[PDB]
C-alpha cells in the first residue's frame, strides 16, 4: 500500500482498486448486534468531543466558529469519508491540536486586524491545492519510514493525554464545587 | 411559474441519478483494470 | 452589513479554483516535461 | 447493473415522499374513482396479460406504473393548478391521477414486451409531466371540453407509445418474434381486464363530469356507445378473417373503442342514438386497424405496438376528437371549432415530441434493456414457476 | 369420518338460526358501497390471493368462502351480544361491515395453515377465533379505548398471530424442508395477482369503512391510498434487492405491496399528513420483503412455524408496525388517547391471539376431523373433485 508507482496519482487509483471492490461487503458486514452497539458507543465518543470542543472554539474565537458549526462539519466529512473513504473504521473529528491552532489564528487576526474567519476560507484554500499535490506525486509513500517506534509513541502518548484530561475534567468539577 | 419548478424537480432527479451512475460507472472502469 | 465587492461569492471560488486549477496544470506539466529529457 | 432498478425506485419514492412534504395538504364521488381504480390496476393489467410468456410483467409492471403515476401525476397536476403553491388532496386529485397513470399505460402497451422495469419508471416520471402540461394547456389555455379525455389521455398516450417504440426500433423485431404469441389460458385471462374496462368506463367518462346534467349524459352515451361498439367489433372481426372465425384480439380490445371515442361528446347533448352511432364507428375503425394498420406499422414504419394501442386508444381517440369538433358544428356543445381542433393537434404533437425524447433517453444502454431474443419473456426480470 | 364436516357445518347453520332468532332483528346507504368493497375484499381478494399453489386452488378459494359466509354469521352475532351486553339488538351496515372483519381475521389465520387443514378444521378455527377476536377488539375499542380504525393490531396483527400459533401447534415433522405441491405455477400466479390487486385497490375503503364522516373517513381514504402507492415501490425495490440477479418474485409482488394498506390502519384517520402516510408504507413494503427472504425460512426450520402465505410477513409485522406508528403518532400529537392505551391494544392484540390460537390448535390437533397426510398436504384431490386437464 505504500509502494511508489511513478504514476501521477498512482497511489489514489490503487487505494479505489483495492477498496473499492469490496463496497458491497462493507454493507452486508454490518448487520451484527456488535456493529449496532459499536455505533451508540462512538456516537458519544464523537459527540462529546464535538460539543466541548465546540464550546471552546466559540469562547476562544468570539463564536465566529462554535458548537453548531463543528457538529455540522463532523457529521457531513464523516458521511462523505463513510461513504467514499478506503479506511471507514477511521473517526473524522476536531482535536485537540487543532483547538491550538484557532486559537493562535484569531490572536494572529487580532493583532493584525484581519478577519478570523475569512483567513480561514483562504487557508481551507491553500489546503487544496496542497492535497491535491501530495496524493498527485505520492507524498504519502513517504508513511513507510514511520516505524512501529513513531507509531507506538505517537499512540502511547495520546492516550495518555486523552487519559489526563479525562482526571483533569474530573478535577475541575470539584473545584468548581 | 410551476412549469419552472417541475422542470427543476426533474433536473434534479436527472442530476441524482446520473451522478450516481456516473461514479459508478468511474468506480467500474477503475476497478476492472 | 456586508461590504459589497465586483465578484459575487460563486464567481470569486469560481475565479479562486480555476486559477488553483491552472497552476496544479502547470505544476504537472512541468514534472511531466521533467524526468524525460 | 443488477442494483440500477432498486435504486431509482427508492430515489423516486424518497423524492415522492420529500415532494409530498412539501406541497400537500389534506366523498360523494368515491365510488366512480373506485371504478376508475379497478379500470387502472385490473382492467389495464390483466388486459395486457394476453402474452404468453410475459403475463408477470404485464399485471405486475402495471401495478408498479400506475402506483408510481398516481403520485407523480398527483404533485405535477397539483403543482400545475396551484401554480407552485401548496394544495389540497380530495377524491378529484387521485381520479386524475388514476387518469395520468391510465396514460402511462397506454404508453406501456406500445412498448410491452420489449423495455425493462427501469425503463417504465423513468417513461412514468417524463410521461407525466408532458401529460400533465398537455392537458393543462387543453383545460385552460384552451379550454376545450374533453370529458371522457379521448384526446388528452387515449390519443396522446397512443402516439406517445408509438413514438417511443418507434424510436425503441429494433431490426430483429420486425418479421416477428416467437414469444409474441397469446396462449389459450393467457386470452382467458386477459378477457378479464377486457370485461372490468368495458363495465366501468361510464364512471371512466363522468367522474370529473359537472354534476347534473353532464355526469348523467356522460354515464349514458358512455353506455350505449360500448354496447354499439361491441356488436360491430364482433361484427368486422369475423369479416376480416377467414371464414367470419372471431379474433381474441379484436374482441380484447376494439370492444373497448365506443368507450374512447365518445369521450369527448360523452357530456354534450349527442343522444344515445348519437353516441351508438359513434361507438359503432369506433368498433369498426379499432377492427380495420388491427387488421390492416398494424402490420403496415410494424413492417413499413417500423414502428412495432404490441397491445395495438393506436387501434384503441390512437384512432378512436382521434376519431372522438374529430367529433366533439363535429359537434360542436351542430350546436352540441358551447365550447368553440377552433379549441377543439388545437385541443387535437395540440395533444397529437405534444405526445410525439414527449415520446421521441423519451425514447431516446430510453435508448441509452442503461436500464437492462432486454435482449432480441428475451423479448416478451418474463424470466429476464421475474423468476418463472417451473409449470404453467 | 364421511358426514364429520356436512353434520359439523349444518348442525353450526341450525345454531346460527336460532342464535339470529333469539337476538338479532332488523347512514346504510351512504356506507354500502364502502361495505360492497370490504366485501369485494374478503371473499375475492383474500379468496384469489392464497391460490398461488398449484394444486390447491379449489380449496383455498373454495374454503375461503366456507369461513367467510359461516365467519360473517357469526360475527354478526359474537360482536353484537358484546356490544348488546346480551340484549336482542338491531342490524346495520356497520354489522355487516364489522362481522367481514372479523371474518378478514379468520381468513388472515387461514393463511398460516393453508394446505395443511380440512374444512372441518377451518369450521372449528372460524367459531373459536371469531369469539377471541371479538372480546380482544371490545377489550381495545371500549375499555383501553383506542383508535384503530384500520385495525393493524385488532385484525392483522391478532389474526397473523393468531395463524402462527395454530401453525406452531399443527406442526407437521415431515414438512420442514419443504413439499413438492407446496410450489406456485404461471396461471395459479396471475390468479393470485387477481386478489392481490382486488386487496390493494378497495383497502381504502376497508381502512375508512368504520371512521367518523367528514375529516376522519377522508384522511383514511387518502392516508391508506398513498401508502399503498409507496408500498408498492418499496416492496418491488426490496424484491429486486434481496433475490437472486435481481429477478422480481412473485411472491412478494403479490402479498408486500399490501404492507402500505396494512401497516397504515391504526394511523389512518389521525393526521400523520399523506407524506407521513407514504413513510409507513414505504417502511412496511421494506419489512414485509425482508421478512418474506429472512423471516419466514427461520420460522419455519429454527422455531418450527411453518406459515404457507407468509401471512407473518404480510398481517403480522406490518401490523405491529402500524400500532407503534400509532404510538409515535399520539406522542406527535396526530391523536388523541394515551401513548399507554395504545400500547396496551398491541400487546392484547398479540397476547390474545397466541393464548386463543394455541387452545384452538390444541383443539384443531385431535385426530377427528379428517387432516390431510404430510403427502397430501396442498392438494385439492383430498377434499375435492379435480379435472384430469389443468
Known amino acids: 500500500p505504500l509502494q511508489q508507482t511513478g504514476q501521477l496519482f498512482g497511489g489514489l487509483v490503487r487505494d479505489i482498486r483495492r477498496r473499492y471492490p469490496y463496497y458491497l461487503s462493507d454493507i452486508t458486514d454490518a448487520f451484527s448486534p456488535q456493529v449496532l452497539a459499536a455505533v451508540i458507543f462512538i456516537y458519544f465518543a464523537a459527540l462529546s468531543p464535538a460539543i466541548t470542543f465546540g464550546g471552546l472554539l466559540g469562547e476562544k474565537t468570539r463564536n465566529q466558529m462554535g458548537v453548531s458549526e463543528l457538529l455540522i462539519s463532523t457529521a457531513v466529512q464523516g458521511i462523505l469519508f463513510a461513504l467514499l473513504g478506503a479506511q471507514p473504521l477511521l473517526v473524522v473529528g476536531f482535536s485537540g491540536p487543532l483547538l491550538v491552532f484557532e486559537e493562535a489564528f484569531f490572536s494572529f487576526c487580532e493583532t493584525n486586524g484581519l478577519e478570523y474567519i475569512v483567513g480561514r476560507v483562504w487557508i481551507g484554500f491553500w489546503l487544496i491545492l496542497l492535497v491535491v499535490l501530495v496524493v498527485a506525486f505520492e507524498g504519502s509513500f513517504l508513511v513507510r519510514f514511520i516505524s512501529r517506534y513513531t507509531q507506538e509513541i505517537f499512540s502511547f502518548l495520546i492516550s495518555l493525554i486523552f487519559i489526563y484530561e479525562t482526571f483533569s475534567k474530573l478535577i475541575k468539577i470539584f473545584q468548581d464545587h | ?33 | 452589513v456586508q461590504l459589497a465587492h465586483h465578484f459575487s461569492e460563486p464567481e470569486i471560488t469560481l475565479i479562486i479554483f480555476g486559477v488553483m486549477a491552472g497552476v496544479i496544470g502547470t505544476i504537472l506539466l512541468i514534472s511531466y516535461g521533467i524526468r524525460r529529457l | 447493473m443488477r442494483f440500477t432498478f432498486p435504486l431509482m425506485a427508492i430515489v423516486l419514492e424518497i423524492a415522492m415522499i420529500v415532494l409530498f412534504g412539501l406541497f400537500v395538504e389534506y366523498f360523494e364521488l368515491y365510488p366512480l374513482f373506485q371504478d376508475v381504480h379497478v379500470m387502472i390496476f385490473v382492467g389495464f393489467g390483466f388486459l395486457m396479460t394476453f402474452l404468453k410468456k410475459y403475463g408477470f410483467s404485464s399485471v405486475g409492471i402495471n401495478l408498479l406504473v400506475a402506483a408510481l403515476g398516481l403520485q407523480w401525476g398527483t404533485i405535477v397536476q397539483g403543482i400545475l393548478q396551484s401554480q407552485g403553491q401548496k394544495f389540497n388532496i380530495g377524491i378529484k386529485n387521485m381520479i386524475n391521477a388514476d387518469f395520468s397513470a391510465a396514460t402511462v399505460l397506454i404508453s406501456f402497451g406500445a412498448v410491452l414486451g420489449k423495455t425493462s422495469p427501469t425503463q417504465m419508471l423513468i417513461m412514468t416520471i417524463l410521461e407525466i409531466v408532458f401529460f400533465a402540461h398537455n392537458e393543462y394547456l387543453v383545460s385552460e389555455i384552451f379550454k376545450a371540453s374533453d370529458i371522457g379525455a379521448s384526446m388528452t389521455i387515449h390519443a396522446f398516450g397512443a402516439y406517445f407509445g408509438l413514438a417511443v417504440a418507434g424510436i425503441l426500433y429494433r431490426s430483429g423485431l420486425r418479421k416477428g418474434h416467437e414469444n409474441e404469441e397469446s396462449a389459450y389460458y393467457s386470452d382467458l385471462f386477459a378477457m378479464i381486464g377486457t370485461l372490468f374496462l368495458w363495465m366501468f368506463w361510464p364512471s371512466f367518462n363522468s367522474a370529473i363530469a359537472e354534476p347534473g346534467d353532464k355526469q348523467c349524459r356522460a354515464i349514458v352515451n358512455t353506455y350505449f356507445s360500448l354496447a354499439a361498439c361491441v356488436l360491430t367489433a364482433f361484427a368486422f372481426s369475423s369479416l376480416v378473417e377467414h371464414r367470419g372465425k372471431l379474433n381474441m384480439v379484436h374482441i380484447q380490445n376494439a370492444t373497448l373503442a365506443g368507450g374512447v371515442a365518445v369521450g369527448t361528446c360523452a357530456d354534450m347533448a349527442i343522444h344515445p342514438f348519437g353516441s351508438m352511432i359513434i361507438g359503432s364507428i369506433a368498433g369498426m375503425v379499432s377492427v380495420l386497424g388491427y387488421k390492416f394498420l398494424t402490420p403496415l406499422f410494424t413492417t413499413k414504419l417500423r414502428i412495432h405496438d404490441t397491445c395495438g394501442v393506436h387501434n384503441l386508444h390512437g384512432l378512436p381517440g382521434v376519431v372522438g376528437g374529430l367529433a366533439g369538433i363535429v359537434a360542436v358544428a351542430m350546436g352540441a356543445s358551447n365550447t368553440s371549432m377552433a379549441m377543439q381542433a388545437a385541443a387535437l393537434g395540440s395533444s397529437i404533437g405534444t405526445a410525439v415530441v414527449g415520446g421521441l425524447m423519451t425514447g431516446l433517453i430510453l435508448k441509452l444502454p442503461l436500464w437492462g434493456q432486454p435482449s432480441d431474443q428475451n423479448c416478451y419473456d418474463d424470466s429476464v426480470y421475474w423468476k418463472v414457476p417451473k409449470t404453467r
Open chain 2, 1 to 33: 411559474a410551476p412549469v419552472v419548478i417541475i422542470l427543476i424537480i426533474l433536473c434534479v432527479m436527472a442530476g441524482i441519478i446520473g451522478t450516481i451512475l456516473l461514479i459508478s460507472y468511474s468506480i467500474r472502469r477503475l476497478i476492472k483494470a
